[PDB]
Design a protein around this ligand. Structure first.
Ligand SMILES: Nc1ncnc2c1ncn2[C@@H]1O[C@H](COP(=O)(O)OP(=O)(O)OP(=O)(O)O)[C@@H](O)[C@H]1O
Ligand SMILES: [Mg+2]
Ligand SMILES: [Mg+2]
Lengths: 385, 50, 380, 124
């Protein structure tokens, strides 16, 4: 509350100050155009008529010629002319070629594709750590694999043990698995890549395997990293059937990722967060520990856990201090943390029908009936016989 | 200019030059295509009401 | 309450404007690679740009008729001739050619095909691993020495017995058996070249493009002497047929077929060993499994108790351990399983000790790590 | 085009396929391939001869009893059989004797089998 206000005051004088500084600083009159810049500039316009049709450098022959494939089915045996060093260019690089005559005018690309930008989602994690009402014990298993080598390399180095490779998150939805994922992400401040596995299920020829390779390249470039392959099972054990053109694709994608997860050796610097509902009643495709190490089963919320979650929610409510908190959680059997979240939302909705702006003392005892009854129907547990 | 441009914005181009013309907000998406078949959803609550 | 609501509302606008101001910062300054003295290069470069000898359109001789019949890659055929002077003996079926944009004459013969260059990126040279620190005392480790080393080191004995030299080994085992690990170790020790092919990567298809790559790579090998060609994960693509499906597919039968025929019948080889990595022999087409392709098959056998104490020790050395720690006792409690399972147990024992705030892992830690892994596998 | 009586005699055609049930249906109509040859399983006689072909390459060992080997094997085609031969000699290469013994061979069948060679057993 107050802690948040203190911060607002500082954030609004930082932005203001920066913005004003920036005019001058960027230039607006500074206008570097002295001999070093002028050189670059003059040359660049002359040489480069535009548009410039990109290539891929297939091989070099030492005689300042290269062999490139252009987007046209005819390839072109080109001169290297001007700019980019011969050494700096290594085969497999994507390159700028001049449209009048194809010559290597430089590189600025590095095999830039839109696919990498899409995946790249470092962007502000919605979760900070321990905003969540989850239990200390569950998060301090994910943290142990992922955080702990980055914060304290001293202990791992001294022991001599390798840093762990991967974790698997599985529950039980409504244990806030993806909340957990973005709690971890905030702390590390690592490049947080995300890709969903259904984008790798397509009828399109061979595209799945191409995508799989991209992922390892991306993580390594932007290391240290966490790669969230979310619904890993979409590619794997989970299905899209084979009487739909799937007798080609699904096999090739599953194998491909599998082969790169082992690799010639575990990378040991790319953390993974693998999501899947549970691989207990599903087939396992996440191929043995040492490449996925510690595997994390989140408990179904017990009575003490939901107390902590419940405390967040009751703060905004007024007239729930007279209501005894303890008795609402007990009376309900042990159930999802999602069901306490559902209850809070329903509770407010319900107060409005009574016509009271925020919950009445009565409204809260009533709220429990509607949510418990709905949820037990949705999910029925074996009846004791 | 490069300032105005935004990543992933669809653009018009003149001839084989490929000089910028206008930016297009305009995007082909299936949801939009489904809406056009669908049109303005009719109708009053009361008629449904019972 | 209310006068402090409006403090939030102000905050939000600011943060958004700063982010757009990044574009303005980057500015308009353009500068390209070629520092120190490669911008003085550019001055030479200018006059030669206006000059003409580049590009050359690339085409490929498809027949030499004593002029030449060239076929371009857009698919269009021409009769052409020699340019400055191009010897007849240089131009051969499959040989690329450099021809002029529109005056259509050969300047330089160019080495055949652009497809080796693409696939030579995948190829990795003689990997190195030390055979001594290869876990287990496996029987499998020994039969690899017979296949690979002994024909290369002493081809004489094989001639004398009047057996054929062993050249094919099929590796299969559960994941974590160490198929990749042992192949790298015998590549190193025997001092023979190595060719990495990954069959899972084949996707370039036009009905039989995958078949072109495979013929070229295997042929690359023959040219090479004392070499290994390791086709990795041929479980699918050049592995299983997808004919079985309702609509089905046969781009995989093309790739599969080509490989079978290169192996089957006469065809020279320059001491080419054939290593095949399949997770399961079941997935592998039976055509390949049954003999006259790969000579030998070994079913990997999970490490012995002596071999399992042995892998654990390798790990325990890397670790900081208790003095008098009973490696053998830990191992016995542990299932008969891969070298992998054992790698994991040492990993978690390390971590629980760190959590508990110890720098030396106790015997007790590894009792905990074991209990963890058994349960995992079981529950699934 | 080969049909007739002049075109059949010059131009001859052989064809090889494994599965015969996946073919084009216009091929099972008429006499497109004028003769169809099914391979039978090998006999005792067939096995014993193929072994001899392989064994000649190797040093002649009259301790080899072609008959005894052939009796225990059932349904090993030509390629399978050569696998056996190479294995008996491989034991002998380790041994150092240029000689291959009949004993090496009886053991050498069981690697080419699904089972690993001389699988451990509780009684013996
Ligand atoms: N002999 C061994 N000693 C120690 N650890 C071993 C041994 N063999 C394999 N491992 C361990 O198992 C894991 C994978 O080994 P490796 O990469 O060779 O697997 P593989 O059987 O070839 O699998 P894939 O099916 O993924 O291709 C590693 O964690 C490695 O340390
Ligand atoms: Mg979720
Ligand atoms: Mg492997």
């Amino acid at each position: 509350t107050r802690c948040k206000l203190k911060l607002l005051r500082m954030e609004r004088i930082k932005d203001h100050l920066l913005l004003e500084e920036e005019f001058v600083s960027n230039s607006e009159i500074l206008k570097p155009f002295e001999k070093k810049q002028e050189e670059e500039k003059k040359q660049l316009e002359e040489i480069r008529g535009n548009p410039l049709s990109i290539g891929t450098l297939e091989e070099i022959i030492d005689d300042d010629h290269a062999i490139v494939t252009s987007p046209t089915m005819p390839d072109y045996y080109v001169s290297i002319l001007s700019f980019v060093d011969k050494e700096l260019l290594e085969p497999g690089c994507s390159v700028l070629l001049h449209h009048k005559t194809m010559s290597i005018v430089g590189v600025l690309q590095d095999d830039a594709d839109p696919m990498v930008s899409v995946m790249k989602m470092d962007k502000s994690p919605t979760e900070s750590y321990s905003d969540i009402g989850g239990l200390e014990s569950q998060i301090q298993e994910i943290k142990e694999s992922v955080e702990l080598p980055l914060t304290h390399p001293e202990l791992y180095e001294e022991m001599g043990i390798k840093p762990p490779k991967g974790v698997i998150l599985y529950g039980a939805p409504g244990t806030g698995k993806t909340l957990l994922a973005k709690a971890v992400a905030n702390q590390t401040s690592a490049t947080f890549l995300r890709i969903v596995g259904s984008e790798l299920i397509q009828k399109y020829l061979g595209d799945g395997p191409r995508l799989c390779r991209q992922i390892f390249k991306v993580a390594g470039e932007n290391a240290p990293s966490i790669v969230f392959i979310d619904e890993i099972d979409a590619i794997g054990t989970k299905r899209y059937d084979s009487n739909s053109g799937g007798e080609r694709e699904i096999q090739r994608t599953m194998l491909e990722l599998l082969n790169q997860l082992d690799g010639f050796d575990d990378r040991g610097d790319v953390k993974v967060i693998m999501a899947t509902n549970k691989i207990e009643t599903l087939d396992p495709a996440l191929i043995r520990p040492g490449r996925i190490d510690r595997k994390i089963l989140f408990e179904n919320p017990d009575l003490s856990t939901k107390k902590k979650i419940l405390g967040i929610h009751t703060s905004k409510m007024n007239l729930s201090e007279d209501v005894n908190l303890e008795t609402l959680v007990t009376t309900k059997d042990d159930l999802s943390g999602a069901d306490i979240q559902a209850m809070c939302t329903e509770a407010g909705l319900l107060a409005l029908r009574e016509r009271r702006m925020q919950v009445t003392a009565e409204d809260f005892k009533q709220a429990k009936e509607r949510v418990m009854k709905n949820k037990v129907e949705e999910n029925l547990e074996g009846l004791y016989l | 200019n490069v300032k105005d441009l935004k990543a992933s914005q669809r653009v018009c181009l003149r001839s084989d030059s490929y000089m910028l013309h206008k930016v297009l907000e305009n995007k082909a998406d299936p949801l939009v295509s489904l809406m056009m078949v669908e049109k303005v959803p009719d109708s009053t609550y009361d008629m449904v009401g019972g | 309450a209310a006068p402090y609501a409006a403090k939030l509302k102000q905050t939000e606008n600011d943060l958004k404007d700063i982010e757009a101001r990044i574009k303005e910062k980057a500015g308009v300054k353009e500068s390209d690679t070629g520092l120190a003295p490669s911008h003085l290069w550019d001055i030479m470069g200018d006059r030669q740009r206006l000059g003409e000898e580049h590009p050359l359109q690339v085409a490929r001789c498809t027949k030499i008729i004593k002029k030449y019949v060239i076929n371009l890659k857009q698919i269009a055929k021409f009769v052409v001739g020699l340019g400055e002077r191009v010897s007849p003996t240089d131009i051969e079926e499959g040989m690329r050619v450099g021809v002029d944009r529109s005056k259509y004459n050969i300047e330089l013969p160019l080495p055949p095909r652009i497809d080796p260059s693409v696939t030579m990126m995948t190829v990795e040279e003689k990997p190195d691993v030390t055979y001594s620190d290869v876990g287990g005392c496996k029987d499998q480790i020994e039969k690899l020495r017979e296949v690979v080393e002994l024909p290369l080191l002493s081809p004489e004995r094989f001639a004398t017995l009047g057996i054929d030299p062993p050249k094919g080994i099929l590796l299969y085992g559960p994941p974590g058996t160490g198929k990749t690990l042992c192949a790298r170790a015998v590549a190193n020790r025997t001092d023979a070249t190595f060719i990495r092919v990954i069959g899972s990567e084949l996707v370039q298809k036009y009905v039989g493009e995958g078949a072109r790559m495979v013929r070229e790579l295997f042929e690359m090998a023959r040219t090479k002497k004392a070499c290994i060609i390791f086709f990795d994960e041929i479980d699918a693509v050049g592995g299983a047929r997808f004919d079985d499906g309702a609509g089905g597919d046969n781009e995989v039968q093309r790739t599969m077929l080509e490989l079978i025929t290169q192996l089957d019948g006469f065809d020279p080889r320059g001491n080419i060993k054939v290593m095949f990595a399949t997770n399961r022999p079941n997935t592998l087409d039976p055509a390949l499994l049954r003999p006259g392709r790969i000579d030998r098959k070994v079913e990997f056998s999970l490490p012995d108790l002596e071999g399992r104490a042995n892998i654990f020790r390798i790990h325990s050395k890397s670790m900081s351990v208790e003095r008098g720690i009973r490696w053998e006792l830990i191992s016995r409690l542990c299932p008969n399983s891969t070298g992998a399972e054992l790698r994991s147990v040492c990993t978690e024992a390390g971590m629980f000790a760190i959590r508990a705030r110890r720098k030396v892992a106790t015997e007790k830690d590894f009792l905990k790590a074991v209990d963890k892994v058994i349960s995992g596998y079981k529950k699934f | 085009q080969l049909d007739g009586f002049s075109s059949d005699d010059r131009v001859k055609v052989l064809a090889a396929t494994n599965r015969v049930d996946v073919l084009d249906p216009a091929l099972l109509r008429s006499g497109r391939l004028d003769r169809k040859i099914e391979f039978p399983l090998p006999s005792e006689d067939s096995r014993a001869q193929i072994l001899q072909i392989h064994s000649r390459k190797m040093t002649t060992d009259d301790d080899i009893n072609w008959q005894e080997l052939a009796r225990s094997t059932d349904e090993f085609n030509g390629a399978q059989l050569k696998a056996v031969t190479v294995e008996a000699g491989m034991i002998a290469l380790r041994n150092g004797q240029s000689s291959v013994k009949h004993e090496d061979f009886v053991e050498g069948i069981s690697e080419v089998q699904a089972r690993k060679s001389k699988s451990v057993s509780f009684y013996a």
